[PDB]
Design a protein around this ligand. Structure first.
Ligand SMILES: *CCCN(CC[C@H](N)C(=O)O)C[C@H]1O[C@@H](n2cnc3c(N)ncnc32)[C@H](O)[C@@H]1O
Length: 271
C-alpha cells in the first residue's frame, strides 16, 4: 500500500521538483542520452489533511500557472486525473514521466518499507535500476555515466550536524569522477548558521559554478522548525537562473499568502 506522508507536496517539495523538472527539460534539448541519478529516492509516490494543502494544492489548478511550471504540474495532474489531489509524485516519478526512451534512471533507497514500493514503481521500466544501497556511495559507484550526461539529485535526511558534512564530501567525490554533470542538492533551513557552514564547506571544495535557489515561508528563526528550503545546483543549465527569477515571485505569492519569508536566486560560486 502506498506510503502516506504528512509533509509530502509541501512548499519544499514544490521547490525541489520544480527545479528538478526544469533541469530535466533542459537536458532533453540535446538528443544524446543522459542519466538521472537519485541518491535518496524514497518510496516513489505519496498518498495524501497534510502540508500539501499549503503547497501543491495552492498552485496545481491555478489558471495563471507560469510556463516554467507546466512540465512539473502536468506530472502531478497525470497522477490525479480526477481533479482531486490524492497522490503526490516523488522525484523518481517526476523523472520516470519526463525522461525519454533513450535515458537511464539509477535510484537508491535504504528504507526497508519504502524500497519495495520504489522497486514496484519501476518493475516494468527497463530504463531504470533500483537498489537498496547507500545513496552517497552511488556518487562513487555510478559516476561517471557511460552517457557522460546526467542530473544527480541528492535529497537526504539531515538528522545531525555530521550529515551536513557528509553531503558535501559526497558531492566532492561525485564531482571528482564526473565534473560536468549537474548536481542538485536539496537542503532544509532550521538553523541558518548550519546552512552557512555547509555552504562554506562546499566552497572549500574548489567546485565552481554553484547556484543557490531558496524559498522561505517564514523568516529565519530559532524555534520554528523548518522555515525554508533550497536547491544548490552545481553546473546549472544556463536558463535555470532566469527561469527561477520568472517563477519564484509567483510561487512565493501562491505558497505564502501572508507574504512572509523570501524567494531568491543567487550564485554561491561563479563560473
Ligand atoms: C529530505 C528527505 C527526502 N526523502 C527522499 C524523497 C525523494 N527524493 C522524493 O523527492 O520524493 C524522503 C524519503 O527518504 C526516505 N527516508 C529514509 N529515511 C528517512 C529519514 N530519516 N527521514 C526522511 N526520509 C527518509 C523515505 O522514503 C522518505 O519518504
Amino acid at each position: 500500500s502506498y506510503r502516506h506522508s504528512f509533509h509530502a507536496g509541501n512548499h519544499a517539495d514544490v521547490l525541489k521538483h520544480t527545479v528538478q523538472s526544469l533541469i530535466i527539460e533542459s537536458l532533453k534539448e540535446k538528443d544524446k542520452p543522459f542519466l538521472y541519478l537519485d541518491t535518496h529516492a524514497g518510496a516513489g509516490r505519496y498518498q495524501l489533511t497534510g502540508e500539501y494543502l499549503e503547497g501543491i494544492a495552492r498552485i496545481w489548478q491555478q489558471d495563471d500557472l507560469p510556463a516554467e511550471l507546466e512540465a512539473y504540474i502536468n506530472v502531478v495532474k497525470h497522477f490525479n486525473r480526477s481533479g482531486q489531489l490524492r497522490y503526490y509524485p516523488g522525484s523518481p516519478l517526476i523523472a520516470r514521466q519526463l525522461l525519454r526512451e533513450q535515458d537511464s534512471l539509477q535510484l537508491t533507497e535504504l528504507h526497508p518499507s519504502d524500497y519495495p514500493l520504489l522497486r514496484s514503481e519501476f518493475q516494468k521500466d527497463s530504463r531504470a535500476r533500483v537498489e537498496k544501497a547507500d545513496g552517497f556511495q552511488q556518487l562513487k559507484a555510478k559516476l561517471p555515466p557511460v552517457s557522460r550526461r546526467g542530473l544527480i539529485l541528492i535529497d537526504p535526511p539531515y538528522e545531525m550536524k555530521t550529515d551536513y558534512q557528509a553531503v558535501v564530501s559526497g558531492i566532492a567525490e561525485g564531482y571528482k569522477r564526473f565534473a560536468t554533470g549537474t548536481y542538485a542538492l536539496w537542503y532544509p533551513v532550521v538553523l541558518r548558521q548550519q546552512i552557512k557552514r555547509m555552504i562554506h564547506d562546499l566552497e572549500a571544495t574548489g567546485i565552481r559554478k554553484i547556484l543557490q535557489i531558496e524559498l522561505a515561508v517564514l523568516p529565519d528563526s530559532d524555534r520554528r522548525g523548518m522555515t525554508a528550503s533550497g536547491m544548490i545546483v552545481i553546473n546549472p543549465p544556463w536558463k535555470l537562473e532566469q527561469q527561477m527569477n520568472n517563477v519564484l515571485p509567483w510561487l512565493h505569492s501562491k505558497l505564502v499568502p501572508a507574504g512572509t519569508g523570501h524567494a531568491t536566486v543567487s550564485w554561491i560560486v561563479p563560473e
